[PDB]
Amino acid sequence: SGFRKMAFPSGKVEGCMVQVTCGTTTLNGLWLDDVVYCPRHVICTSEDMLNPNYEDLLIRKSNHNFLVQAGNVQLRVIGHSMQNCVLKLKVDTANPKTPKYKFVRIQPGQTFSVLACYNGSPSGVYQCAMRPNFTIKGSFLNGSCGSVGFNIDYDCVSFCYMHHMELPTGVHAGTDLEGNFYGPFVDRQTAQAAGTDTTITVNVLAWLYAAVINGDRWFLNRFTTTLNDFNLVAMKYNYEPLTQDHVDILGPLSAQTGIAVLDMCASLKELLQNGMNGRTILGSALLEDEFTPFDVVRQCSGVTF
Amino acid sequence: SGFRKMAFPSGKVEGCMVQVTCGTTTLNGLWLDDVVYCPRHVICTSEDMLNPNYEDLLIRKSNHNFLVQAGNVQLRVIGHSMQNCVLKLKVDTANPKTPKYKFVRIQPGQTFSVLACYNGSPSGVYQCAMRPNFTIKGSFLNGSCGSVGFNIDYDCVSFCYMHHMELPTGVHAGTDLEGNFYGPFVDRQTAQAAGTDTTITVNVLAWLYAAVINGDRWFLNRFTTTLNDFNLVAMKYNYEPLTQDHVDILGPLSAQTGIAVLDMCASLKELLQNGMNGRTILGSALLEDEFTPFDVVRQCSGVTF
Ligand SMILES: CNC(=O)CN1Cc2ccc(Cl)cc2[C@@]2(CCN(c3cncc4c3CCCC4)C2=O)C1
Numbered sequence: 386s387g388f389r390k391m392a393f394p395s396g397k398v399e400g401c402m403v404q405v406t407c408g409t410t411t412l413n414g415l416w417l418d419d420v421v422y423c424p425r426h427v428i429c430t431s432e433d434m435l436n437p438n439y440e441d442l443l444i445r446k447s448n449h450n451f452l453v454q455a456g457n458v459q460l461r462v463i464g465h466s467m468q469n470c471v472l473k474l475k476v477d478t479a480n481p482k483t484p485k486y487k488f489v490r491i492q493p494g495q496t497f498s499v500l501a502c503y504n505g506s507p508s509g510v511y512q513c514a515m516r517p518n519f520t521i522k523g524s525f526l527n528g529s530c531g532s533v534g535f536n537i538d539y540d541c542v543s544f545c546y547m548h549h550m551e552l553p554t555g556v557h558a559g560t561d562l563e564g565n566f567y568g569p570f571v572d573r574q575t576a577q578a579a580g581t582d583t584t585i586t587v588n589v590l591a592w593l594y595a596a597v598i599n600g601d602r603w604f605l606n607r608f609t610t611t612l613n614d615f616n617l618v619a620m621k622y623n624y625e626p627l628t629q630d631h632v633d634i635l636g637p638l639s640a641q642t643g644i645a646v647l648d649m650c651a652s653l654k655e656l657l658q659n660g661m662n663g664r665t666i667l668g669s670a671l672l673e674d675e676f677t678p679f680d681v682v683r684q685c686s687g688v689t690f
Numbered sequence: 691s692g693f694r695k696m697a698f699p700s701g702k703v704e705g706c707m708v709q710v711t712c713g714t715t716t717l718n719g720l721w722l723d724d725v726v727y728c729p730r731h732v733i734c735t736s737e738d739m740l741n742p743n744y745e746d747l748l749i750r751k752s753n754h755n756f757l758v759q760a761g762n763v764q765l766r767v768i769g770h771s772m773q774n775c776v777l778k779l780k781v782d783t784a785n786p787k788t789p790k791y792k793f794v795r796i797q798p799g800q801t802f803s804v805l806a807c808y809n810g811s812p813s814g815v816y817q818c819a820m821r822p823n824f825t826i827k828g829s830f831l832n833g834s835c836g837s838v839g840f841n842i843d844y845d846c847v848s849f850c851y852m853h854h855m856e857l858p859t860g861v862h863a864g865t866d867l868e869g870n871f872y873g874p875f876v877d878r879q880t881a882q883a884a885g886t887d888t889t890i891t892v893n894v895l896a897w898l899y900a901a902v903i904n905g906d907r908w909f910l911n912r913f914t915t916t917l918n919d920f921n922l923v924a925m926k927y928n929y930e931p932l933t934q935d936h937v938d939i940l941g942p943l944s945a946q947t948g949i950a951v952l953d954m955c956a957s958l959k960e961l962l963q964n965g966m967n968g969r970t971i972l973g974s975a976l977l978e979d980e981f982t983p984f985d986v987v988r989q990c991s992g993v994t995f
């Protein structure tokens with residue numbers, strides 16, 4: 386029993402974290418085989434950030450202008466190239482701790498673990514989700530850029546996020562490991578803001594199924610709803626539309642508990658229209674949306690890595 | 691910016707997890723140097739739990755009755771002894787991945803990271819606190835026994851918890867790494883139950899200081915309180931008594947924000963009386979008590995917004 390926001394074991398990623406320093410800027414890099422991946426803004430000063438021409442800033446740099454430190458060992462940069470908003474530093478040493486890995490681009494609603502780093506040294510691990518507005522609600526201070534997000538499937542690390550910046554509301558924006566931003570953000574000091582966010586409906590439903598699995602059943606009722614009527618209600622509370630794909634994905638949880646997806650949608654409709662009335666679900670007074678259907682199944686089954 | 695329940699990077703602990711098998715029982719062990727530490731109930735059957743005589747069950751076992759597996763390698767047991775509720779298995783191989791470590795017994799209110807494991811393989815990492823009633827609100831299924839709790843201040847791992855059991859309310863009980871239980875719990879299937887739990891007051895105060903540091907003051911008021919009057923109010927809400935030690939410990943957070951401890955106590959009294967009135971503090975609609983003053987200082991910016 387129990388239900389916690391659980392992150393993946395971070396060891397396979399800790400062995401890839403390095404410090405990258407170019408000029409007066411210092412941030413984190415991901416060292417996989419003989420390449421170190423880091424945000425391209427490592428080549429920028431504060432004034433450059435206002436309107437940077439990255440290709441022009443990069444051409445003026447040599448390999449010895451980049452200082453890469455892995456623990457207390459200095460790695461030698463022997464090549465450099467840019468791919469979208471990510472700088473790729475070719476180093477003379479392959480990482481002996483390189484795990485089996487893939488670079489994957491995630492969709493909004495999907496969760497991942499973040500290994501927060503400062504000066505190439507990991508400080509903490511936490512779980513979060515890609516919001517519908519493509520921002521993440523992370524915990525990052527200055528020096529955290531280059532921190533990565535990932536998931537694990539058996540022995541393989543799927544790197545999905547690299548930290549680049551913080552928006553005015555305190556939320557975070559970054560890229561996949563190919564340097565493509567999530568959301569309409571650009572890597573420069575210009576007016577940028579998170580769009581209006583919505584609640585990840587399929588994730589709230591998965592967390593309601595987790596509450597039922599753990600013994601919390603007060604919100605269940607005799608009623609059902611159509612998918613269209615549920616979406617008409619959800620749209621009014623800034624909840625994401627629930628699709629037939631979402632109902633299919635909730636199937637295993639609908640089978641383990643004996644509660645149909647539309648049966649559970651009628652419970653969420655009542656919670657949206659009445660609130661919790663002084664009660665909690667899994668120790669929370671808010672409807673939680675940062676656990677996917679897969680996270681619920683994995684935590685209520687004991688999947689190992 | 692941001693504030694998350696953050697766990698320590700688990701890599702140093704992942705390299706110590708092994709599988710211990712005795713007869714038909716299989717659980718987790720912690721391999722440090724040439725010793726594997728695991729719960730002594732690994733030598734018990736389900737019937738043995740009603741009234742186990744551990745000394746009598748242990749004397750009938752030889753070294754080769756214990757199967758220790760580290761990854762896909764079988765370790766050889768060359769000695770066994772019992773220390774309180776833990777079994778210590780002397781193995782012929784020292785763990786080459788043994789980190790710098792200490793065994794520390796924690797007090798109620800203190801937090802730690804848990805690396806949940808099944809069959810010697812880590813599955814997830816989450817943060818939690820030793821409750822005032824000496825239980826933890828973990829997430830553990832059958833096969834998780836022997837999973838450990840730890841802190842990693844500097845490069846040293848301080849092991850503080852080993853998982854042994856789940857109580858009727860779904861909370862968890864275990865020992866320090868010397869085999870001494872936290873709480874009046876026994877590794878016997880008795881009518882033991884978790885005592886009435888209370889809120890960790892010093893931790894709620896620390897989290898209110900974190901909210902102020904992150905730029906939020908809506909909950910503050912122009913009032914102050916004596917320590918005794920605050921405790922008379924707090925105990926009516928099942929909050930732990932706040933001691934002068936707790937006041938001293940909150941000093942740095944009080945200095946960084948300019949808000950006196952007894953003035954933050956007055957905001958807490960008012961929040962208990964009024965609720966949040968549709969507002970949240972650091973993304974939560976409940977008063978959070980699983981962040982110590984030390985965790986807030988570790989995570990938050992040294993500069994108040
Ligand atoms: C909040 N941002 C700023 O004050 C200026 N920022 C311009 C800027 C412009 C484009 C890009 Cl791609 C990055 C950046 C910076 C680089 C570092 N960074 C950042 C990242 N994570 C967390 C925190 C920060 C800044 C201090 C608060 C915590 C940014 O957003 C800095």
Ligand SMILES: CNC(=O)CN1Cc2ccc(Cl)cc2[C@@]2(CCN(c3cncc4c3CCCC4)C2=O)C1
Pocket residue numbers: 386731739830831832833834835854855856857876877878879880
């Ligand atoms: C709920 N308790 C039981 O079913 C019987 N349990 C008596 C018992 C009595 C004393 C001791 Cl020290 C151990 C134990 C067991 C050993 C394993 N275990 C356990 C541990 N963590 C999580 C979960 C469990 C059981 C299934 C639910 C998840 C226990 O409590 C077994």
Ligand SMILES: [Cl-]
Pocket residue numbers: 795796797800
């Ligand atoms: Cl302590």
